[PDB]
Amino acid sequence: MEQRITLKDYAMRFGQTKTAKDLGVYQSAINKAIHAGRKIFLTINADGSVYAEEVKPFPSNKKTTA
Amino acid sequence: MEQRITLKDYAMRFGQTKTAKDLGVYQSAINKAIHAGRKIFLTINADGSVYAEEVKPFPSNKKTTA
């Protein structure tokens, strides 16, 4: 079991204040992350753990299949 | 244990012209990815296929996991 949600879906659907309180970062760090609109996923474990990671295929533009 | 080479080891040990030919990208795209050193790995599927991806933890570098 493990709650997997994007940093923007957990901060927007639950609140950036709680996403920054669980990750420790400040609201300016969670807002800057959403500002980069990059691949920032959030791997929260049932133990109230927050494991945000970054994963984006290169390059940034262009289009390819997985 | 697939072939995992960094975009810098495949473009420097083989050439940025060949690495861009497998990923079908621009030479300035592999040069900017190497200049940003944003954890850009190059996974070459055993089928001679290429799959460059990005992967970095948040925020800077998790010191202790859980």
Swiss-Prot record, chains A, B:
One of its GO terms (molecular function) is protein homodimerization activity. InterPro entries: Cro-like (IPR000655), Cro_sf (IPR038202), Lambda_DNA-bd_dom_sf (IPR010982). Disulfide bonds: none annotated. One of its GO terms (biological process) is response to UV. Gene3D superfamilies: CRO Repressor. Residues 16-35 bind DNA. Keywords: DNA-binding, Early protein, Latency-replication decision, Repressor, Transcription, Transcription regulation, Viral latency, Viral latency initiation and maintenance. Pfam families: Cro. Plays an essential role in the switch from lysogenic to lytic state and in fine-tuning the lytic phase activation. Mediates the de-repression of the lytic promoters from repression by cI at an early stage of prophage induction. Turns down the expression of the transcriptional activator cII, a factor that initiates the expression of repressor cI, the major component promoting latency. Additionally, cro is able to directly bind to the promoter region of cI thereby preventing the transcription of cI repressor. Binds DNA as a homodimer. This is Regulatory protein cro. It comes from Escherichia phage lambda. The lineage of its organism: Viruses, Duplodnaviria, Heunggongvirae, Uroviricota, Caudoviricetes. The gene is cro.
